[PDB]
Amino acid sequence: VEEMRSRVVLGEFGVRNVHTTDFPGNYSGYDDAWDQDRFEKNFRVDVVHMDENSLEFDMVGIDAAIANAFRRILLAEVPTMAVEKVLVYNNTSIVQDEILAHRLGLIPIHADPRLFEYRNQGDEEGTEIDTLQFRLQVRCTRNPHAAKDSSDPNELYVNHKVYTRHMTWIPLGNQADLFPEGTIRPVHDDILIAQLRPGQEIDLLMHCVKGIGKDHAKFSPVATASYRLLPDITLLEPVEGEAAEELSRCFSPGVIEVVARVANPRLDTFSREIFRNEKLKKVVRLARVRDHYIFSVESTGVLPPDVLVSEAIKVLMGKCRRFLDELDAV
């Protein structure tokens, strides 16, 4: 009689409706055969809470298959620049060479991609159109005004800790297009690379390349790029008389109002505490809307997150125009 192919329903032991189930000739009476202007009208994007290094826009009105492209494309197919070859000179640190050279890899780099191109051949020399070199020269001694205390900031601290402030930029070529903080070493200047004791050196050049995130996860532009369907919670029965404040502490705190009203459902983490109550579990069905999700992009800081998403859509479109031109050849 009534069709919730539009809500997944979360039981106590399983998640019930799950698969999309809306294609031609599945639900009789319903014509769902990809009307383009119907999708064009029922779709909007509602942005909530975009500061630096976060984004929580919505994208209401697409299936969870194309939404799992934009999560996946953000995660491992939007390119970034990261350190790939660490040309090492004298390095007398106690940190091992590869583990240093691996820890230089995970540092993000504020120079945005799509100014540069990929590295074509092996090409370990770089061509200043592909790469971006960095220098790291730290040699720590004792400071002369050190007191007798064993405080490592006070004594032994010329450069006891190799932060990413010590990395600098060797402009490879013209490199006048980018400005002074233009290639701000590691997006974060507080990252601890290694620790030293006096008489120890770290001297190394670096090479940065433009890499897909699926090649290696140090190229990943985003911390987490997950998404989640917007929940909607329907009290089938009116709840009042101290069972409302019982249902208040049952859910997430901000979600509810006190009679009982489901004030704001978007803030609900799925603890599923109702089924512990043994009385209200028959009262309210909890559900999540299928075509209304909540994206949550938090960039590492290479590109601002409103330009990560608009790049993520831009390379999915490029992935299908790459194939549509294959059929034009054939």
Site for other proteins in 52-71 (CB under 8 A): 57, 59, 62-69, 71
Count of residues that interact with other proteins, criterion CB under 8 A? 104
For residue 205 the two structure tokens come to 């050049």
Least distance between other proteins and beta carbon 174 (Å):
30
Give 267's DSSP letter.
Answer: G
Q: What is the DSSP string of 11-75?
A: -SS---S-S---STTSSTT---S--HHHHHHS-B-------TT-B----BT--TTTHHHHHHHHH
| Stretch touching other proteins by CB under 8 A, among 117-125, 172-180, 236-244, 312-320 | 312-320
80 binds other proteins (CB under 8 A): no
- Alpha carbon distance 41, 61 (integer Å): 9
Closest C-alpha among 218, 228, 222, 230 to residue 312:
222
Nearer to other proteins, 64 or 283 (CB): 64
What is the pattern of x (binds other proteins, CB under 8 A) and - over residues 133-172? -------------------x--------x--x--------
| DSSP 8-state code for residue 276 | G
Q: Rounded to an integer, what distance in angstroms lies between the CA atom of residue 184 and that of residue 187?
A: 6
Please tell me the distance from the alpha carbon of residue 208 to that of residue 219, in angstroms, as a whole number: 10
Contacting other proteins (CB under 8 A), which of 39, 98, 170, 261? 39
- Kind and range of the H or E run holding 219: none
Helix residue ranges per DSSP H, 149-293: 243-250
Options 38-46, 119-127, 137-145, 234-242: segment touching other proteins (CB under 8 A): 38-46
Q: Give least dist CB 173 to other proteins, A.
A: 29
Among 87, 129, 192, 258, binds other proteins (CB under 8 A): 192
Q: After which residues is the chain broken (C to N over 2.5 A)?
A: 258
What tokens were used for 240?
A: 């009042």
Exactly one of 139, 166, 281, 314 binds other proteins (CB under 8 A); that residue is: 314
Residues 222-261 that bind other proteins (CB under 8 A): 223-226, 228-229, 252
* Residue 322 sits in the site that holds other proteins (CB under 8 A): yes
Longest dimension (CA), the chain: 86
The one segment of 82-90, 168-176, 233-241, 322-330 that binds other proteins by CB under 8 A: 322-330
Nearest distance, CB of residue 180 and other proteins, angstroms = 22
Within residues 91-120, the interface with other proteins by CB under 8 A covers: 94-95, 99, 103, 106-108
Residue 45 binds other proteins (CB under 8 A): yes
Residue placing its CB nearer to other proteins in the complex, 71 or 292 = 71
**Phi, psi values for residue 195, rounded to 5°:** -115, 150
